[PDB]
Structure 1
Amino acid sequence: MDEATWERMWKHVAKIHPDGEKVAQRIRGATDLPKIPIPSVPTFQPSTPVPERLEAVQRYIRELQYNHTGTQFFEIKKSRPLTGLMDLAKEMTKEALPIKCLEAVILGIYLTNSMPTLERFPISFKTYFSGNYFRHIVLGVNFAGRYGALGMSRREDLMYKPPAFRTLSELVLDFEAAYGRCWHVLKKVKLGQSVSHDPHSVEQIEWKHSVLDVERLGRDDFRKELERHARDMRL
C-alpha cells in the first residue's frame, strides 16, 4: 500500500489498542522482525479426490491468517464481474497478507475453479447478540451430492465444514447450532447462486438469490426453502 494508507493503519492501531503508540514504536522500524514464509498456492494431481483438495485449499486460507489489524488490505466490491475478482484473488496469493471472511470466499472460488464437479455458492449469515447485529459469510460447496463449506472466521466452527452433510439444510443448521453455542441468534440467511468456474467470466456473483428470515419463516418453512434453493442450484 502507499504511505497514506500505511500511516492510516498505524494511527488506527494507535486508537484501538490500549497502548496504541508503544506498539507502533516497537514494530515500525524493527530490524529483528520474524520473517514470515510466503504460503505455497495448493496444486492438485488429477488422482487426488476433491475432498482432499478442499482440505488443502482450507489449509492455505488459514495459512494467510485472520486479519486482526483493523485495516483491510484487499477491498472487495461485491458487484465486480468475476474476472475482476479473480484478478484480485491472484493478488492476495502474491501479496500474502491476512484476510477476513469476504476475502476468503473470493479466494475459495479462485482456488476451486479447477474443480468443475464442485459447485460453489456464497452463504451469508446475520446474527444478533447483546444488542448488536453481526454479518458473516462462507463459501458453500457441493461435491457428489453432499454439502460443505470453505471460509475464514474468528471461530473454528464458523468456517470449514467438510462436504459430508446430506442436505443443504443440515449444513446451514450446523452453522446455526455453532452460532447458538456462542449465544448468537441466527436472524437471516442469504444464499447465492452457483459461481461459474471460468475465471475470465464477465458475470457478477449473485449474492442474494434467496433470503430466508429464520424467525418469520419458522423451522419447517426454513428447511423447505433451503431445499428449493438447493434444487434451483441444479439449474
Structure 2
Amino acid sequence: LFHVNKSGFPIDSHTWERMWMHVAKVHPKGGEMVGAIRNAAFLAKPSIPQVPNYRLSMTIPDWLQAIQNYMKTLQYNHTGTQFFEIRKMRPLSGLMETAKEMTRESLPIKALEAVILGIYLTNGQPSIERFPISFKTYFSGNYFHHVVLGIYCNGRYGSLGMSRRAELMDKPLTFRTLSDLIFDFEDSYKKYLHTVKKVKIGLYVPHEPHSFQPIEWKQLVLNVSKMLRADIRKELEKYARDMRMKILK
C-alpha cells in the first residue's frame, strides 16, 4: 500500500529511499530512468499554478469548473506516496492549515486531500454548500474505497473529486436529485466492471474555517448492492430532505 510522509518538510532520508525503492521495484524497466532522473544535472522548473479568486460577475457552475481545472492542472498523484498526512478525526482548523500550506507548496494530490482542497477553496461562498461522499466497492477479489465532494448550489447537485480514471471524479451541477447523482456514479463504476457494495454520505460542512468541528462521514450508510434501487432512492431522497432542512443532528 502507498505510504505517507510524516516528517513535515523536507522529506527525510528514510521515506526518500523507501519511495525510490518502491518506484524502482514497480517500474518494469526500473533503474534506467530512475538513475537518469536522480543524476540529472538540470531539469525544467515546474510553473506555479495560481490560486483562482472568486469574482461576482462570473457564474457558480463556472466556478466549480474552474476549481476542477486547477485541480486537474495540479497533476494528480500516482507516485504511490502521500505527501501530506491527514487525520479524519482531526478538528477542522488543522485541516485548513494543511490545505493552505498544501496550496503554498502545490505538490501532487490524491482523492482525500483533493476533497479537502475543494472544501478549502469553496469555504468562501455561503451560497455554495458542500459535503462528502464515500464508496466501498469490490473488484477482482479485493475491496477498494473512494471519496468525493458533492455540492448543492442553486438547488442542483454536482460533484468534484479526483481519481486515476477520468469520469469518476467530476460532474456538473445538472442533477435534480441526489439519487440520480449516486446512480450515475454507480453506472460509471459498473463501466469499469467494479461492483459497489456500500455507500456512505456525511453532512454539510460548516462555513466557519477556524472551528474545531470534525468532519462526519458515516451519518448515513447503506449496502447498495444487496437492496433494489427503488428503496435506495426512497431512503436517499428522505435523507436529502432531512439534510437540506438541517434537521439531522
Bin of the TM-score, shorter chain as denominator length: over 0.9
Deviations 1:135-158 (A, max 9, x none): 111001111111011101111110
Task: Quote the residue 1:159 is aligned against.
Answer: 169
Distance 2:58 2:91 in 1: 30
Task: Quote the residue 2:240 is aligned against.
Answer: 230
2:63 equivalent to 1:53? yes
Task: Quote the residue 1:71 is aligned against.
Answer: 81
Give 1:230 deviation, angstroms. 1.1
Query: 1:212–1:225: 8 Å Cα contact kept in structure 2?
Result: no
Question: Which structure 2 residue ranges, 5 or more long, are not aligned?
Answer: 1-10
Q: Secondary structure at the match of 1:211?
A: strand
Task: Quote the residue 2:13 is aligned against.
Answer: 3
Give 1:212 deviation, angstroms. 1.1
Task: Quote the residue 1:219 is aligned against.
Answer: 229
The farther-off stretch of 42-51 and 185-194 is 42-51
The farther-off stretch of 119-128 and 1-10 is 1-10
Divergent runs of 4+, >3 A: none
Q: Secondary structure at the match of 2:56?
A: coil
Residues 35-184 of structure 1 correspond to what in structure 2 (within 5 A)?
35-184=45-194
Query: 2:78–2:164: 8 Å Cα contact kept in structure 1?
Result: no
Number of residue pairs matched by the alignment: 235
Give 1:2 deviation, angstroms. 2.4
Normalising by structure 1, we get a TM-score of 0.96
Give 1:80 deviation, angstroms. 0.9
Question: Which structure 1 residue ranges, 5 or more long, are not aligned?
Answer: none
Give 1:215 deviation, angstroms. 2.3
Deviations 1:17-47 (A, max 9, x none): 1233333201113123232111111111122
Query: 1:50–1:115: 8 Å Cα contact kept in structure 2?
Result: no
Give 1:70 deviation, angstroms. 1.1
Q: Which amino acid aligns with 1:200?
A: H
Q: Which amino acid aligns with 1:171?
A: L
Identity of aligned residues (%): 62
Give 1:110 deviation, angstroms. 0.1
The farther-off stretch of 100-109 and 216-225 is 216-225
Normalising by structure 2, we get a TM-score of 0.90
